[PDB]
Design an enzyme around this catalytic site. Structure first.
Site, short mmCIF file in Angstrom:
data_model
loop_
_atom_site.label_atom_id
_atom_site.label_comp_id
_atom_site.label_asym_id
_atom_site.label_seq_id
_atom_site.Cartn_x
_atom_site.Cartn_y
_atom_site.Cartn_z
CD1 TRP A 1 38.19 39.87 56.07
CD2 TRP A 1 39.75 40.95 56.95
NE1 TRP A 1 38.86 40.56 54.83
CE2 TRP A 1 39.80 41.26 55.81
CE3 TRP A 1 40.69 41.54 57.82
CZ2 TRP A 1 41.00 42.21 55.04
CZ3 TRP A 1 41.87 42.37 57.24
CH2 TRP A 1 41.69 42.60 56.00
CG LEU B 1 36.14 36.75 47.71
CD1 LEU B 1 37.51 36.12 48.04
CD2 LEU B 1 35.01 35.85 47.98
CG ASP C 1 35.36 36.69 56.51
OD1 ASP C 1 35.97 36.28 55.62
OD2 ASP C 1 35.57 37.00 57.42
CG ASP C 2 37.75 40.42 51.21
OD1 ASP C 2 38.43 41.05 52.28
OD2 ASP C 2 37.55 40.59 50.22
CB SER C 3 33.58 43.86 51.91
OG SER C 3 32.78 44.74 51.35
#
Length: 205
Positions: A139, A162, A158-160
DNA sequence: GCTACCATCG
DNA sequence: CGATGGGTAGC
């Protein structure tokens, strides 16, 4: 500027939802800062972990104001001359304070890849190299690649946040796994950074 | 007025 | 495991 125009046109050539989103959001205003040295971009990325842009900014602001005589980003030497106790007072978590100090040491001792070498590395190579740094993983390297390096095809799958946006955008029944976001955004190549930016603008609508 | 929202370490 | 940094959008 020309890259963004081309990126916007490509995103508007995929399915209908991308076309619609780009139209509603308008021109991409993403502003990376490749002039920043690797240690600065890395520290900025570490600071942002688990924090909103505003919270991160208030911390960096204090950092630059207190640990710099010209209000510019503290040099590796200045950061070294500051103990973790003082760094923590700026808003850096205790863990982050320790990591930032180490990054500063590394920069001073030429242990971090030079910007020149970083520019010749593929994202896969960047991942393998920078992940060796305590506090720096997938990240964080993606954010550094986007906001500092200015790379255009980075999909921080892997961005929450997004992922939450992707769930709404793609009309999914549950928050997608990282692998699923990667699959769904494949058509966005070679401008996945811009695609990510647009997804990130959904809340601002 | 409240309070949810990366990667490391004993 | 269970903490951890802080501005602020959504309630």
């Amino acid at each position: 500027d020309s890259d963004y125009k081309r990126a916007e046109k490509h995103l508007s050539s995929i399915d209908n939802k991308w076309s619609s989103l780009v139209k509603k959001v308008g021109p991409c205003t993403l502003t990376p800062h490749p002039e920043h040295a690797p240690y600065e971009g890395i520290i900025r990325a570490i600071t942002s972990q688990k924090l909103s842009d505003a919270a991160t900014n208030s911390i960096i602001n204090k950092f630059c104001t207190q640990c710099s005589d010209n209000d510019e980003f503290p040099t590796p030497k200045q950061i070294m001359e500051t103990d973790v106790e003082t760094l923590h007072e700026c808003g850096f978590s205790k863990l982050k304070s320790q990591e930032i100090h180490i990054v500063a040491e590394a920069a001073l001792n030429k242990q971090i890849p030079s910007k020149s070498e970083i520019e010749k590395m593929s994202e896969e190579e960047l991942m393998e190299s920078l992940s060796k740094i305590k506090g720096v993983k997938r990240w964080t390297i993606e954010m550094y690649s986007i906001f500092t390096l200015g790379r255009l095809d980075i999909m921080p799958a892997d961005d929450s946040t997004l992922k939450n946006e992707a769930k709404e955008f793609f009309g999914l029944s549950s928050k997608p796994q990282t692998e699923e976001v990667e699959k769904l955004t494949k058509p966005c190549k070679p401008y996945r950074t811009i695609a990510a930016w647009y997804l990130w603008q959904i809340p601002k609508l």
